Symmetry: C3
Subunit: 90 residues, 3 copies
């Protein structure tokens, strides 16, 4: 009945990332203190959650994107989005 969103932030500027699931895809909007812009993250899904943490100055992001079938973890560790080891069951 609406879009579904997830948000994380870090530092004191701050940086913010808002993930939105809408019409079958999850997209990303970014704030680094200078205006909102569209981020590189783009994956299929109907539901999203996110968490992040800093290691010094470097941000690490984990996005849990769920399609009708599968929850996939996507990792940002400074050099592109990569598939994470997360599984719902083992």
């Amino acid at each position: 009945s609406s879009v579904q969103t997830a948000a994380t932030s870090w530092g004191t500027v701050p940086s913010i990332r808002v993930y939105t699931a809408n019409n079958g895809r999850i997209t990303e909007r970014c704030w680094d203190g200078r205006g909102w812009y569209t981020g590189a993250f783009n994956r299929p899904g109907r539901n999203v959650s996110v968490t992040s943490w800093l290691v010094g100055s470097a941000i690490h992001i984990r996005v849990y994107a769920s399609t009708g079938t599968t929850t996939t973890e996507w990792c940002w560790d400074g050099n592109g989005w990569t598939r994470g080891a997360y599984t719902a069951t083992n």
Copy 2:
């Protein structure tokens, strides 16, 4: 099939804020270590997410409230809730 919630916390007391979307509106319940109370935040919406960060002692909160139409960012920076610059597309 249920209410939808979003939560954030800060400090070591801690302070907690739980946002609940139910029956067309998003309301807020607050913990500052002395019992739960109803907060000032009250906006239309079916989906909510939240993030927050501290600048020293001062809390800054961003709530992303999504109606059927629109995702609106609401800002708490110590002196009331204000509309944020967030847009889903530019």
Copy 3:
């Protein structure tokens, strides 16, 4: 149309907890740097949110689990999951 998830993380390893609402129950998957494993948390619900904070080295987690009827707060403070004081209305 999909599962619904919520995530939190802490420290620099880090530790991550991903809560998934699916088929009437909320379950937990855990990362402590050595592989994903199933956590002790298991409660009824259709929607979940989570927040956590550290007090020194000790993690404190709050999970807001919502069934069709009720939002219940579940607390992890180092010695099992316990019912929290949270209420949606007072």
